[PDB]
Symmetry: C2
Subunit: 316 residues, 2 copies
C-alpha cells in the first residue's frame, strides 16, 4: 500500500541497523542514508497502521506558513507540541518563581508527584501566554523556528528574507528551475540552538505540470517523529501546488541518521503486524488560493480509517 515505504524503513532498521549511542542517552538502532518516495496522486500518506493526529500537523504547518514564531497561535488550537521550548526559557529566568523544575523532562517520566507539580507550572504558563500579551511577547516567542527560517531569514545587512515566498514566485515564473530550494540551516545560529533543525532543507521540482518535493532530514525518530514529518511535507507539497496551479507529484523523503530508540522496539514490532488500510484523501479549499492566508477549515482529510494509536515513551 501507499505507506509501505515507512513500514519497510522500520523493518530495515530493525534487522540491519547497528546500535548507536545518542544525545538523549536512550540507545538507538541506526542507519545512515535512506530515501522513500510517495506518489501523492495515489493518496495522502497519513499512516493507517497507527492513529496520527492530523489536526496537530495541520495547525503546525499553518503556524510555519504565517512565519509565526509565537506559541500563542498553537495553544489557541490546543497544540502543545512546542510548549516545552517556551517553558524551558520561562523556567530558566529571573522572573520565574516556583519549584526548581530543573530537568523537568526526565523527572516527570521518573517521579509521579513531580509529573503533577511540573504539569501544573506548565498549565499556568500556557494560560499566561494565552492571556498576558506582554508575557506571550517575551516567553511565547521561540525566535528561531521554521516560521522565521522559512519566511524571515535574517541577513547580515540587517534585513529579512522570505525564502518560501520567493521560491513560490520562482515556481510560477521558472518552473524548470533547479534552484527551487528553501533552507532552515543557518551556520551562525545552529551552534547555540537548543534544537538545530531536523528538517534541514527541501527542494521543489516541476515537470509535466506536476510538482514534486524532496526533503533532507538530518535526524529522524522513526517511530514517533517520522509519521508526523511525512504528513507535514506531503501537505506542504499539496498547498504549494494548489497556489501554483500545478498538479501534485511525489514527496521524496531523504534521511541522514534514521533511527529507532531502543525503548520503542515492542511498539514498532506490533505495528508491523497490522495491515495497511487504503489511504485517506486530501481536500483543499478551491476558492481560496493564497496559502499564506489559509486556515484550519480550508483543508479536509477524507476517509482516514486508522488502527488504534500506540503509546510509547518519549525518549528524554
Amino acid at each position: 500500500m501507499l505507506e509501505q515505504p515507512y513500514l519497510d524503513l522500520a523493518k530495515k532498521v530493525l534487522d540491519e541497523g547497528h546500535f548507536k549511542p545518542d544525545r538523549t542517552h536512550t540507545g538507538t538502532y541506526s542507519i545512515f542514508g535512506h530515501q522513500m518516495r510517495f506518489d501523492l496522486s495515489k493518496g495522502f500518506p497519513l499512516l493507517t497502521t497507527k492513529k496520527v493526529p492530523f489536526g496537530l500537523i495541520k495547525s503546525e504547518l499553518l503556524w510555519f506558513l504565517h512565519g509565526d514564531t509565537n506559541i500563542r497561535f498553537l495553544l489557541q488550537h490546543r497544540n502543545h507540541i512546542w510548549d516545552e521550548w517556551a517553558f524551558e526559557k520561562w523556567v530558566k529566568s529571573d522572573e520565574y518563581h516556583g519549584p526548581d523544575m530543573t530537568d523537568f523532562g526526565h523527572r516527570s517520566q521518573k517521579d509521579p508527584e513531580f509529573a503533577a507539580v511540573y504539569h501544573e507550572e506548565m498549565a499556568k504558563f500556557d494560560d499566561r501566554v494565552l492571556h498576558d500579551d506582554a508575557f506571550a511577547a517575551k516567553y511565547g516567542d521561540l525566535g528561531l523556528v521554521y516560521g522565521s527560517q522559512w519566511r524571515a531569514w535574517h541577513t547580515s545587512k540587517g534585513d529579512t528574507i522570505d525564502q518560501l515566498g520567493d521560491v513560490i514566485e520562482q515556481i510560477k515564473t521558472h518552473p524548470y528551475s533547479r534552484t527551487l530550494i528553501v533552507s532552515a540551516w543557518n551556520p551562525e545560529d545552529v551552534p547555540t540552538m537548543a534544537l538545530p533543525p531536523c528538517h534541514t532543507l527541501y527542494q521543489f521540482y516541476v515537470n509535466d505540470g506536476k510538482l514534486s518535493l524532496q526533503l533532507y532530514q538530518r535526524s529522524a525518530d522513526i517511530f514517533l517523529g517520522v509519521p508526523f514529518n511525512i504528513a507535514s511535507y506531503a501537505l506542504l507539497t499539496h498547498l504549494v501546488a494548489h497556489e501554483c496551479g500545478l498538479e501534485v507529484g511525489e514527496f521524496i523523503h531523504t534521511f541522514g541518521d534514521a533511527h529507532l530508540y531502543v525503548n520503542h522496539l515492542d511498539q514498532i514490532k506490533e505495528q508491523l503486524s497490522r495491515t495497511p488500510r487504503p489511504a485517506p484523501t486530501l481536500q483543499l479549499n478551491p476558492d481560496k488560493h493564497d496559502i499564506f492566508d489559509f486556515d484550519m477549515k480550508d483543508i479536509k482529510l477524507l476517509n482516514y480509517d486508522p488502527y488504534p494509536a500506540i503509546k510509547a515513551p518519549v525518549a528524554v
Copy 2:
C-alpha cells in the same frame, strides 16, 4: 563492480527520465531524487569505464580545504576548471580592453575564428593573474566559492565561521553527533550568484569507528559532472577520516535533479558498453595528519586502469 551505481543511474535516466527543458537551453532527460552509495573499503570510486583526471579533482579539493578563493592557486597547478568565472568578471569591466567576448561560451563552440580570439584573451588573463599580484587580487578572486563557504562563512555580526574546521573538532569530541553538517547554501547570496552551489550540503556520520558522509547535490550533469563529484567527496571522506583517526565507511550521494543533456546520449550509451575494471586504491601520507596543510604529493592513487576518455560537448 564498485562503480555500478553510476552506470545504473545513467541507464535509469536513459529509460525512465522525462524530457525537461533547462537554463542552458540544451534539453535534458531528468529524474528527481536518487541515491547511490559507495563502500569506500572496497576501493576508490574513480570511474574505470572512462578516463577521469584525478589530478584536477585533487587540486580543486585542496584549494577548497585551504579556504582559498583565488584562481591563482589552481592555475599554478594547470587547473583551469574555474577560469571561466574569473574571466567573465574581467571581460565585463571598465578595465577590460579588447574584443567584445560577449557570450564567449557559445560563440567558441559555434565560431571557429572566435574560439581562437577568445582562447587568446583567456590565455593572457591566466598569465596576468599568475604574475600580476594586484591583478590576481582583483580578478582572480571569485569571492563566494566552496573555499569561503566551507571555511569562512560570513556572519551578520561581521565575523567569519570555519564550519569545516568546527565540524572536524566535533567529530573528534562527539562522534555520535547527529548535527555534523556543513552547508554551502546561503539564502542571502544565492539570489545574486552566477552559480548557486550544486553541492548544497553534506553530513558526516560515525558508528563502529567508521566515518561515512552523505551529500545533497541539487542538480547534476550525469555524464560530465557526476564522475568528478563522486571523486571529490569520496576523497573528502578519506581525508577527514585520516585526521580523525577513523576508518572509512560509505559515501552516500543523494540527488535532487539528476540529468543527461540531450547532446551526451551517444557518449553515455557507448560508455555503457564498457565493462568495469577493478577499482583503484587511495593512499594518503601517514606522517602528515593536518589535512588543511596537505599538498598534492600527500595523496596517491594506485592502480587506476581506465578505458579511453570520451569527448562530449560542454552544455553551453
